[PDB]
Amino acid sequence: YRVXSYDFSRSDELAKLLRQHAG
C-alpha cells in the first residue's frame, strides 16, 4: 500500500520492508 515513490498493491512485499524495519 502507497509509501512515497510507491503504490505497491502487495502487502507481503510491503510487509517485508516493515518486517525488515523492526528493532
Side-chain angles (χ1 to χ4, degrees):
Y1 45 85
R2 282 273 186 163
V3 179
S5 297
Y6 272 110
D7 70 274
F8 289 96
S9 183
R10 287 288 79 189
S11 71
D12 189 294
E13 202 77 291
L14 179 270
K16 213 177 191 284
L17 294 151
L18 275 68
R19 271 176 181 221
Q20 289 286 87
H21 284 278

